[PDB]
PDB file of N, CA and C in Angstrom:
ATOM      1  N   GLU A  51     -45.980  90.301 -12.305  1.00 27.65           N
ATOM      2  CA  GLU A  51     -44.685  89.677 -12.078  1.00 27.65           C
ATOM      3  C   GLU A  51     -43.697  90.227 -13.097  1.00 27.65           C
ATOM      4  N   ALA A  52     -42.428  90.297 -12.705  1.00 27.57           N
ATOM      5  CA  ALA A  52     -41.399  90.834 -13.582  1.00 27.57           C
ATOM      6  C   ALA A  52     -40.092  90.093 -13.339  1.00 27.57           C
ATOM      7  N   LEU A  53     -39.193  90.188 -14.314  1.00 27.43           N
ATOM      8  CA  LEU A  53     -37.867  89.622 -14.165  1.00 27.43           C
ATOM      9  C   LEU A  53     -37.046  90.443 -13.181  1.00 27.43           C
ATOM     10  N   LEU A  54     -36.042  89.793 -12.603  1.00 28.35           N
ATOM     11  CA  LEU A  54     -35.126  90.443 -11.681  1.00 28.35           C
ATOM     12  C   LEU A  54     -33.728  90.568 -12.272  1.00 28.35           C
ATOM     13  N   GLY A  55     -33.269  89.561 -13.008  1.00 27.38           N
ATOM     14  CA  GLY A  55     -31.976  89.646 -13.660  1.00 27.38           C
ATOM     15  C   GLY A  55     -31.812  88.559 -14.698  1.00 27.38           C
ATOM     16  N   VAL A  56     -30.931  88.825 -15.658  1.00 27.49           N
ATOM     17  CA  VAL A  56     -30.525  87.848 -16.659  1.00 27.49           C
ATOM     18  C   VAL A  56     -29.009  87.749 -16.630  1.00 27.49           C
ATOM     19  N   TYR A  57     -28.496  86.561 -16.317  1.00 24.01           N
ATOM     20  CA  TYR A  57     -27.080  86.359 -16.032  1.00 24.01           C
ATOM     21  C   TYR A  57     -26.541  85.258 -16.930  1.00 24.01           C
ATOM     22  N   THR A  58     -25.358  85.467 -17.507  1.00 26.20           N
ATOM     23  CA  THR A  58     -24.686  84.431 -18.281  1.00 26.20           C
ATOM     24  C   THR A  58     -23.217  84.379 -17.899  1.00 26.20           C
ATOM     25  N   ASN A  59     -22.505  83.451 -18.528  1.00 24.30           N
ATOM     26  CA  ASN A  59     -21.084  83.278 -18.302  1.00 24.30           C
ATOM     27  C   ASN A  59     -20.270  84.102 -19.287  1.00 24.30           C
ATOM     28  N   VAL A  60     -19.042  84.398 -18.885  1.00 21.23           N
ATOM     29  CA  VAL A  60     -17.979  84.789 -19.797  1.00 21.23           C
ATOM     30  C   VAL A  60     -16.954  83.670 -19.747  1.00 21.23           C
ATOM     31  N   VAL A  61     -16.674  83.066 -20.903  1.00 18.18           N
ATOM     32  CA  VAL A  61     -15.854  81.862 -20.939  1.00 18.18           C
ATOM     33  C   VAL A  61     -14.412  82.211 -20.609  1.00 18.18           C
ATOM     34  N   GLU A  62     -13.871  81.544 -19.591  1.00 19.02           N
ATOM     35  CA  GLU A  62     -12.502  81.781 -19.155  1.00 19.02           C
ATOM     36  C   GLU A  62     -11.529  81.297 -20.222  1.00 19.02           C
ATOM     37  N   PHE A  63     -10.821  82.235 -20.837  1.00 19.23           N
ATOM     38  CA  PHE A  63      -9.914  81.950 -21.943  1.00 19.23           C
ATOM     39  C   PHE A  63      -8.530  81.680 -21.370  1.00 19.23           C
ATOM     40  N   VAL A  64      -8.104  80.423 -21.416  1.00 21.35           N
ATOM     41  CA  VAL A  64      -6.793  80.018 -20.927  1.00 21.35           C
ATOM     42  C   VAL A  64      -6.023  79.457 -22.111  1.00 21.35           C
ATOM     43  N   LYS A  65      -4.956  80.145 -22.502  1.00 20.08           N
ATOM     44  CA  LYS A  65      -4.164  79.722 -23.643  1.00 20.08           C
ATOM     45  C   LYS A  65      -2.991  78.865 -23.187  1.00 20.08           C
ATOM     46  N   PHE A  66      -2.203  78.405 -24.159  1.00 23.20           N
ATOM     47  CA  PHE A  66      -1.116  77.478 -23.869  1.00 23.20           C
ATOM     48  C   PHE A  66       0.047  78.180 -23.190  1.00 23.20           C
ATOM     49  N   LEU A  67       0.402  79.364 -23.676  1.00 23.86           N
ATOM     50  CA  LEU A  67       1.664  79.975 -23.288  1.00 23.86           C
ATOM     51  C   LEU A  67       1.574  80.683 -21.940  1.00 23.86           C
ATOM     52  N   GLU A  68       0.367  80.868 -21.400  1.00 21.69           N
ATOM     53  CA  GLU A  68       0.237  81.470 -20.075  1.00 21.69           C
ATOM     54  C   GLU A  68       0.379  80.424 -18.978  1.00 21.69           C
ATOM     55  N   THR A  69       0.077  79.167 -19.287  1.00 20.03           N
ATOM     56  CA  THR A  69       0.252  78.098 -18.318  1.00 20.03           C
ATOM     57  C   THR A  69       1.727  77.778 -18.138  1.00 20.03           C
ATOM     58  N   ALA A  70       2.047  77.156 -17.002  1.00 19.66           N
ATOM     59  CA  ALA A  70       3.425  76.784 -16.698  1.00 19.66           C
ATOM     60  C   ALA A  70       3.863  75.531 -17.434  1.00 19.66           C
ATOM     61  N   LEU A  71       2.955  74.879 -18.165  1.00 24.34           N
ATOM     62  CA  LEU A  71       3.281  73.653 -18.884  1.00 24.34           C
ATOM     63  C   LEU A  71       4.276  73.906 -20.013  1.00 24.34           C
ATOM     64  N   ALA A  72       4.372  75.146 -20.503  1.00 26.16           N
ATOM     65  CA  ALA A  72       5.361  75.470 -21.525  1.00 26.16           C
ATOM     66  C   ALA A  72       6.783  75.534 -20.985  1.00 26.16           C
ATOM     67  N   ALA A  73       6.987  75.368 -19.680  1.00 24.55           N
ATOM     68  CA  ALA A  73       8.326  75.099 -19.187  1.00 24.55           C
ATOM     69  C   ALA A  73       8.829  73.732 -19.603  1.00 24.55           C
ATOM     70  N   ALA A  74       7.937  72.803 -19.928  1.00 23.42           N
ATOM     71  CA  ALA A  74       8.329  71.496 -20.418  1.00 23.42           C
ATOM     72  C   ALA A  74       8.412  71.440 -21.931  1.00 23.42           C
ATOM     73  N   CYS A  75       8.250  72.573 -22.611  1.00 20.74           N
ATOM     74  CA  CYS A  75       8.230  72.586 -24.064  1.00 20.74           C
ATOM     75  C   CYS A  75       9.013  73.771 -24.599  1.00 20.74           C
ATOM     76  N   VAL A  76       9.240  73.735 -25.906  1.00 21.65           N
ATOM     77  CA  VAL A  76       9.887  74.800 -26.660  1.00 21.65           C
ATOM     78  C   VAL A  76       9.005  75.107 -27.862  1.00 21.65           C
ATOM     79  N   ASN A  77       8.510  76.336 -27.941  1.00 21.46           N
ATOM     80  CA  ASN A  77       7.398  76.658 -28.826  1.00 21.46           C
ATOM     81  C   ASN A  77       7.895  77.472 -30.006  1.00 21.46           C
ATOM     82  N   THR A  78       7.655  76.969 -31.216  1.00 20.03           N
ATOM     83  CA  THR A  78       7.994  77.668 -32.451  1.00 20.03           C
ATOM     84  C   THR A  78       6.749  77.748 -33.318  1.00 20.03           C
ATOM     85  N   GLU A  79       6.448  78.944 -33.805  1.00 18.61           N
ATOM     86  CA  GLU A  79       5.347  79.128 -34.737  1.00 18.61           C
ATOM     87  C   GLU A  79       5.846  78.847 -36.144  1.00 18.61           C
ATOM     88  N   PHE A  80       5.192  77.924 -36.832  1.00 15.95           N
ATOM     89  CA  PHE A  80       5.645  77.437 -38.128  1.00 15.95           C
ATOM     90  C   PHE A  80       4.501  77.661 -39.102  1.00 15.95           C
ATOM     91  N   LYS A  81       4.727  78.522 -40.092  1.00 13.56           N
ATOM     92  CA  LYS A  81       3.674  79.036 -40.963  1.00 13.56           C
ATOM     93  C   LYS A  81       2.989  77.982 -41.818  1.00 13.56           C
ATOM     94  N   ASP A  82       3.758  77.143 -42.493  1.00 13.71           N
ATOM     95  CA  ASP A  82       3.192  76.182 -43.432  1.00 13.71           C
ATOM     96  C   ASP A  82       3.660  74.772 -43.078  1.00 13.71           C
ATOM     97  N   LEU A  83       2.961  74.167 -42.125  1.00 13.35           N
ATOM     98  CA  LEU A  83       3.166  72.792 -41.714  1.00 13.35           C
ATOM     99  C   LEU A  83       2.301  71.855 -42.531  1.00 13.35           C
ATOM    100  N   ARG A  84       1.469  72.430 -43.389  1.00 12.47           N
ATOM    101  CA  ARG A  84       0.759  71.688 -44.411  1.00 12.47           C
ATOM    102  C   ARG A  84       1.702  71.232 -45.515  1.00 12.47           C
ATOM    103  N   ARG A  85       2.826  71.929 -45.694  1.00 15.07           N
ATOM    104  CA  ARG A  85       3.747  71.574 -46.764  1.00 15.07           C
ATOM    105  C   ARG A  85       4.785  70.552 -46.324  1.00 15.07           C
ATOM    106  N   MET A  86       5.056  70.445 -45.026  1.00 13.51           N
ATOM    107  CA  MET A  86       6.143  69.597 -44.556  1.00 13.51           C
ATOM    108  C   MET A  86       5.790  68.121 -44.702  1.00 13.51           C
ATOM    109  N   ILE A  87       6.746  67.347 -45.210  1.00 11.87           N
ATOM    110  CA  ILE A  87       6.636  65.895 -45.214  1.00 11.87           C
ATOM    111  C   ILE A  87       7.143  65.351 -43.887  1.00 11.87           C
ATOM    112  N   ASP A  88       8.382  65.688 -43.534  1.00 11.80           N
ATOM    113  CA  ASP A  88       9.072  65.077 -42.407  1.00 11.80           C
ATOM    114  C   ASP A  88       9.883  66.098 -41.630  1.00 11.80           C
ATOM    115  N   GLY A  89      10.200  65.754 -40.399  1.00 13.84           N
ATOM    116  CA  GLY A  89      11.182  66.493 -39.646  1.00 13.84           C
ATOM    117  C   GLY A  89      12.388  65.644 -39.323  1.00 13.84           C
ATOM    118  N   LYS A  90      13.456  66.298 -38.891  1.00 12.35           N
ATOM    119  CA  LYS A  90      14.697  65.581 -38.671  1.00 12.35           C
ATOM    120  C   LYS A  90      15.546  66.329 -37.662  1.00 12.35           C
ATOM    121  N   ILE A  91      16.065  65.583 -36.692  1.00 13.48           N
ATOM    122  CA  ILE A  91      17.137  66.038 -35.821  1.00 13.48           C
ATOM    123  C   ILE A  91      18.176  64.933 -35.723  1.00 13.48           C
ATOM    124  N   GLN A  92      19.416  65.314 -35.988  1.00 14.44           N
ATOM    125  CA  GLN A  92      20.513  64.401 -36.259  1.00 14.44           C
ATOM    126  C   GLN A  92      21.529  64.588 -35.144  1.00 14.44           C
ATOM    127  N   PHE A  93      21.718  63.566 -34.320  1.00 13.11           N
ATOM    128  CA  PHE A  93      22.722  63.597 -33.267  1.00 13.11           C
ATOM    129  C   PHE A  93      23.973  62.879 -33.737  1.00 13.11           C
ATOM    130  N   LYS A  94      25.109  63.240 -33.157  1.00 13.21           N
ATOM    131  CA  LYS A  94      26.367  62.554 -33.418  1.00 13.21           C
ATOM    132  C   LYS A  94      27.140  62.499 -32.113  1.00 13.21           C
ATOM    133  N   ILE A  95      27.110  61.343 -31.465  1.00 11.80           N
ATOM    134  CA  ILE A  95      27.614  61.177 -30.111  1.00 11.80           C
ATOM    135  C   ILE A  95      28.984  60.526 -30.201  1.00 11.80           C
ATOM    136  N   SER A  96      30.021  61.269 -29.841  1.00 12.20           N
ATOM    137  CA  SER A  96      31.382  60.761 -29.850  1.00 12.20           C
ATOM    138  C   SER A  96      31.765  60.332 -28.441  1.00 12.20           C
ATOM    139  N   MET A  97      32.087  59.048 -28.279  1.00 11.78           N
ATOM    140  CA  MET A  97      32.290  58.430 -26.969  1.00 11.78           C
ATOM    141  C   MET A  97      33.772  58.211 -26.697  1.00 11.78           C
ATOM    142  N   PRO A  98      34.320  58.813 -25.644  1.00  9.28           N
ATOM    143  CA  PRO A  98      35.737  58.615 -25.335  1.00  9.28           C
ATOM    144  C   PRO A  98      35.944  57.333 -24.559  1.00  9.28           C
ATOM    145  N   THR A  99      37.179  56.830 -24.582  1.00 10.02           N
ATOM    146  CA  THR A  99      37.540  55.618 -23.858  1.00 10.02           C
ATOM    147  C   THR A  99      38.785  55.851 -23.020  1.00 10.02           C
TER     148      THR A  99
ATOM    149  N   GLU B  51      10.510  68.420 -47.215  1.00 11.26           N
ATOM    150  CA  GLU B  51      10.790  67.851 -45.906  1.00 11.26           C
ATOM    151  C   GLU B  51      11.947  68.619 -45.284  1.00 11.26           C
ATOM    152  N   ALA B  52      11.888  68.798 -43.973  1.00 11.14           N
ATOM    153  CA  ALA B  52      12.770  69.735 -43.301  1.00 11.14           C
ATOM    154  C   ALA B  52      13.983  69.034 -42.708  1.00 11.14           C
ATOM    155  N   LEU B  53      14.878  69.848 -42.159  1.00 11.03           N
ATOM    156  CA  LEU B  53      16.005  69.400 -41.349  1.00 11.03           C
ATOM    157  C   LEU B  53      16.093  70.380 -40.187  1.00 11.03           C
ATOM    158  N   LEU B  54      15.505  70.012 -39.056  1.00  9.23           N
ATOM    159  CA  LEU B  54      15.159  70.982 -38.029  1.00  9.23           C
ATOM    160  C   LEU B  54      16.250  71.214 -36.998  1.00  9.23           C
ATOM    161  N   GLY B  55      17.325  70.444 -37.018  1.00  7.03           N
ATOM    162  CA  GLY B  55      18.378  70.645 -36.049  1.00  7.03           C
ATOM    163  C   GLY B  55      19.438  69.580 -36.203  1.00  7.03           C
ATOM    164  N   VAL B  56      20.654  69.954 -35.827  1.00  9.76           N
ATOM    165  CA  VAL B  56      21.847  69.131 -35.995  1.00  9.76           C
ATOM    166  C   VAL B  56      22.756  69.392 -34.797  1.00  9.76           C
ATOM    167  N   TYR B  57      22.984  68.364 -33.966  1.00  7.71           N
ATOM    168  CA  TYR B  57      23.621  68.557 -32.663  1.00  7.71           C
ATOM    169  C   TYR B  57      24.653  67.474 -32.371  1.00  7.71           C
ATOM    170  N   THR B  58      25.544  67.739 -31.398  1.00  7.55           N
ATOM    171  CA  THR B  58      26.693  66.884 -31.090  1.00  7.55           C
ATOM    172  C   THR B  58      27.324  67.213 -29.742  1.00  7.55           C
ATOM    173  N   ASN B  59      27.604  66.162 -28.969  1.00  7.59           N
ATOM    174  CA  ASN B  59      28.347  66.260 -27.720  1.00  7.59           C
ATOM    175  C   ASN B  59      29.770  66.761 -27.929  1.00  7.59           C
ATOM    176  N   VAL B  60      30.228  67.618 -27.019  1.00  9.27           N
ATOM    177  CA  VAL B  60      31.639  67.982 -26.896  1.00  9.27           C
ATOM    178  C   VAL B  60      32.129  67.475 -25.550  1.00  9.27           C
ATOM    179  N   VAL B  61      33.141  66.617 -25.577  1.00  7.87           N
ATOM    180  CA  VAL B  61      33.640  65.958 -24.379  1.00  7.87           C
ATOM    181  C   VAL B  61      34.733  66.812 -23.757  1.00  7.87           C
ATOM    182  N   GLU B  62      34.508  67.249 -22.522  1.00  6.51           N
ATOM    183  CA  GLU B  62      35.524  67.925 -21.733  1.00  6.51           C
ATOM    184  C   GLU B  62      35.856  67.038 -20.549  1.00  6.51           C
ATOM    185  N   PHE B  63      37.136  66.955 -20.206  1.00  3.64           N
ATOM    186  CA  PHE B  63      37.581  66.157 -19.076  1.00  3.64           C
ATOM    187  C   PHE B  63      38.432  67.001 -18.142  1.00  3.64           C
ATOM    188  N   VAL B  64      38.155  66.889 -16.844  1.00  2.00           N
ATOM    189  CA  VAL B  64      39.003  67.463 -15.803  1.00  2.00           C
ATOM    190  C   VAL B  64      40.243  66.587 -15.686  1.00  2.00           C
ATOM    191  N   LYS B  65      41.417  67.143 -15.983  1.00  2.00           N
ATOM    192  CA  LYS B  65      42.649  66.364 -16.011  1.00  2.00           C
ATOM    193  C   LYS B  65      43.101  66.015 -14.592  1.00  2.00           C
ATOM    194  N   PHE B  66      44.272  65.381 -14.494  1.00  2.05           N
ATOM    195  CA  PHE B  66      44.666  64.745 -13.240  1.00  2.05           C
ATOM    196  C   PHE B  66      45.041  65.760 -12.168  1.00  2.05           C
ATOM    197  N   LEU B  67      45.809  66.782 -12.528  1.00  2.72           N
ATOM    198  CA  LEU B  67      46.297  67.761 -11.565  1.00  2.72           C
ATOM    199  C   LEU B  67      45.219  68.719 -11.076  1.00  2.72           C
ATOM    200  N   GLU B  68      44.007  68.643 -11.621  1.00  2.00           N
ATOM    201  CA  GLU B  68      42.900  69.482 -11.197  1.00  2.00           C
ATOM    202  C   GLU B  68      41.872  68.733 -10.366  1.00  2.00           C
ATOM    203  N   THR B  69      41.957  67.408 -10.296  1.00  3.33           N
ATOM    204  CA  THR B  69      41.108  66.642  -9.404  1.00  3.33           C
ATOM    205  C   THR B  69      41.613  66.764  -7.970  1.00  3.33           C
ATOM    206  N   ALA B  70      40.782  66.327  -7.029  1.00  2.39           N
ATOM    207  CA  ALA B  70      41.184  66.289  -5.632  1.00  2.39           C
ATOM    208  C   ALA B  70      42.007  65.060  -5.295  1.00  2.39           C
ATOM    209  N   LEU B  71      42.224  64.164  -6.259  1.00  4.13           N
ATOM    210  CA  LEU B  71      43.001  62.962  -5.998  1.00  4.13           C
ATOM    211  C   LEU B  71      44.484  63.285  -5.846  1.00  4.13           C
ATOM    212  N   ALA B  72      44.938  64.415  -6.397  1.00  3.83           N
ATOM    213  CA  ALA B  72      46.331  64.823  -6.248  1.00  3.83           C
ATOM    214  C   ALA B  72      46.649  65.363  -4.862  1.00  3.83           C
ATOM    215  N   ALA B  73      45.663  65.466  -3.973  1.00  2.00           N
ATOM    216  CA  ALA B  73      45.933  65.725  -2.569  1.00  2.00           C
ATOM    217  C   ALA B  73      46.489  64.510  -1.846  1.00  2.00           C
ATOM    218  N   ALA B  74      46.468  63.334  -2.473  1.00  3.21           N
ATOM    219  CA  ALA B  74      46.989  62.110  -1.883  1.00  3.21           C
ATOM    220  C   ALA B  74      48.168  61.547  -2.664  1.00  3.21           C
ATOM    221  N   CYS B  75      48.825  62.371  -3.478  1.00  4.62           N
ATOM    222  CA  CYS B  75      50.013  61.945  -4.202  1.00  4.62           C
ATOM    223  C   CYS B  75      50.844  63.170  -4.545  1.00  4.62           C
ATOM    224  N   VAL B  76      52.138  62.948  -4.749  1.00  2.97           N
ATOM    225  CA  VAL B  76      53.073  63.996  -5.144  1.00  2.97           C
ATOM    226  C   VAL B  76      53.457  63.759  -6.599  1.00  2.97           C
ATOM    227  N   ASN B  77      53.369  64.798  -7.423  1.00  2.00           N
ATOM    228  CA  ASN B  77      53.526  64.660  -8.867  1.00  2.00           C
ATOM    229  C   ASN B  77      54.783  65.395  -9.314  1.00  2.00           C
ATOM    230  N   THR B  78      55.764  64.640  -9.803  1.00  2.18           N
ATOM    231  CA  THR B  78      57.032  65.174 -10.299  1.00  2.18           C
ATOM    232  C   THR B  78      57.242  64.625 -11.706  1.00  2.18           C
ATOM    233  N   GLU B  79      56.723  65.342 -12.701  1.00  2.00           N
ATOM    234  CA  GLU B  79      56.765  64.868 -14.078  1.00  2.00           C
ATOM    235  C   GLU B  79      58.178  64.955 -14.641  1.00  2.00           C
ATOM    236  N   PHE B  80      58.654  63.842 -15.191  1.00  2.00           N
ATOM    237  CA  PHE B  80      60.019  63.691 -15.670  1.00  2.00           C
ATOM    238  C   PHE B  80      60.030  63.778 -17.192  1.00  2.00           C
ATOM    239  N   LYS B  81      61.215  64.045 -17.749  1.00  2.00           N
ATOM    240  CA  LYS B  81      61.333  64.339 -19.174  1.00  2.00           C
ATOM    241  C   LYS B  81      61.212  63.082 -20.032  1.00  2.00           C
ATOM    242  N   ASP B  82      61.943  62.021 -19.699  1.00  2.00           N
ATOM    243  CA  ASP B  82      61.762  60.737 -20.380  1.00  2.00           C
ATOM    244  C   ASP B  82      62.020  59.606 -19.388  1.00  2.00           C
ATOM    245  N   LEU B  83      60.933  58.977 -18.940  1.00  2.00           N
ATOM    246  CA  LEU B  83      61.009  57.935 -17.922  1.00  2.00           C
ATOM    247  C   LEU B  83      61.625  56.648 -18.461  1.00  2.00           C
ATOM    248  N   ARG B  84      61.746  56.516 -19.784  1.00  2.00           N
ATOM    249  CA  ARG B  84      62.405  55.373 -20.405  1.00  2.00           C
ATOM    250  C   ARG B  84      63.902  55.309 -20.117  1.00  2.00           C
ATOM    251  N   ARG B  85      64.497  56.388 -19.599  1.00  2.00           N
ATOM    252  CA  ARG B  85      65.936  56.419 -19.361  1.00  2.00           C
ATOM    253  C   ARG B  85      66.341  55.486 -18.226  1.00  2.00           C
ATOM    254  N   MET B  86      65.684  55.590 -17.075  1.00  2.00           N
ATOM    255  CA  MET B  86      65.993  54.739 -15.934  1.00  2.00           C
ATOM    256  C   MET B  86      65.080  53.518 -15.931  1.00  2.00           C
ATOM    257  N   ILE B  87      65.657  52.366 -15.596  1.00  2.00           N
ATOM    258  CA  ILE B  87      64.924  51.107 -15.616  1.00  2.00           C
ATOM    259  C   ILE B  87      64.199  50.910 -14.293  1.00  2.00           C
ATOM    260  N   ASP B  88      64.960  50.826 -13.206  1.00  2.00           N
ATOM    261  CA  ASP B  88      64.409  50.569 -11.887  1.00  2.00           C
ATOM    262  C   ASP B  88      64.939  51.594 -10.900  1.00  2.00           C
ATOM    263  N   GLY B  89      64.030  52.141 -10.100  1.00  2.00           N
ATOM    264  CA  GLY B  89      64.392  52.961  -8.963  1.00  2.00           C
ATOM    265  C   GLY B  89      64.572  52.064  -7.750  1.00  2.00           C
ATOM    266  N   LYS B  90      65.684  52.261  -7.055  1.00  2.00           N
ATOM    267  CA  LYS B  90      66.064  51.427  -5.924  1.00  2.00           C
ATOM    268  C   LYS B  90      66.544  52.297  -4.771  1.00  2.00           C
ATOM    269  N   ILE B  91      65.739  53.295  -4.412  1.00  2.00           N
ATOM    270  CA  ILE B  91      66.113  54.247  -3.371  1.00  2.00           C
ATOM    271  C   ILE B  91      66.109  53.535  -2.022  1.00  2.00           C
ATOM    272  N   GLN B  92      67.203  53.678  -1.277  1.00  2.00           N
ATOM    273  CA  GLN B  92      67.431  53.001  -0.007  1.00  2.00           C
ATOM    274  C   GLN B  92      67.402  54.016   1.125  1.00  2.00           C
ATOM    275  N   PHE B  93      66.678  53.699   2.195  1.00  2.00           N
ATOM    276  CA  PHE B  93      66.522  54.593   3.335  1.00  2.00           C
ATOM    277  C   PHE B  93      67.097  53.970   4.598  1.00  2.00           C
ATOM    278  N   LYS B  94      67.815  54.779   5.375  1.00  2.00           N
ATOM    279  CA  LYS B  94      68.333  54.384   6.681  1.00  2.00           C
ATOM    280  C   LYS B  94      67.462  55.033   7.746  1.00  2.00           C
ATOM    281  N   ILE B  95      66.566  54.256   8.346  1.00  2.00           N
ATOM    282  CA  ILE B  95      65.582  54.771   9.291  1.00  2.00           C
ATOM    283  C   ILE B  95      65.994  54.358  10.694  1.00  2.00           C
ATOM    284  N   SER B  96      66.097  55.337  11.591  1.00  2.00           N
ATOM    285  CA  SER B  96      66.579  55.129  12.947  1.00  2.00           C
ATOM    286  C   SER B  96      65.527  55.548  13.966  1.00  2.00           C
ATOM    287  N   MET B  97      65.119  54.592  14.823  1.00  2.00           N
ATOM    288  CA  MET B  97      64.128  54.746  15.877  1.00  2.00           C
ATOM    289  C   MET B  97      64.759  55.315  17.144  1.00  2.00           C
ATOM    290  N   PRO B  98      63.990  56.024  17.967  1.00  2.00           N
ATOM    291  CA  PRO B  98      64.480  56.424  19.287  1.00  2.00           C
ATOM    292  C   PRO B  98      64.127  55.392  20.348  1.00  2.00           C
ATOM    293  N   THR B  99      64.833  55.479  21.476  1.00  2.00           N
ATOM    294  CA  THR B  99      64.646  54.553  22.584  1.00  2.00           C
ATOM    295  C   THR B  99      64.426  55.319  23.877  1.00  2.00           C
TER     296      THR B  99
END
């Protein structure tokens, strides 16, 4: 008796930026997020009457 | 700690003479409307028989 074949998988590598889900996001690579304490975005909405 | 963005609305308005509402009115801008108190224009309208 003898073997006929040995078969395995190749893991399908699907990253974030190839998917269409990044249409709902804005992606920035940030080198040292270990150093950051806080983030901030400041709006100023002027309302006419 | 960071400051990642700073944003603000700018209000633009379509004025009166650019709307479609001026298709239902005639606009004759006067220099100082405080001069005349009351307009009392009288019309003589004659029907046919």
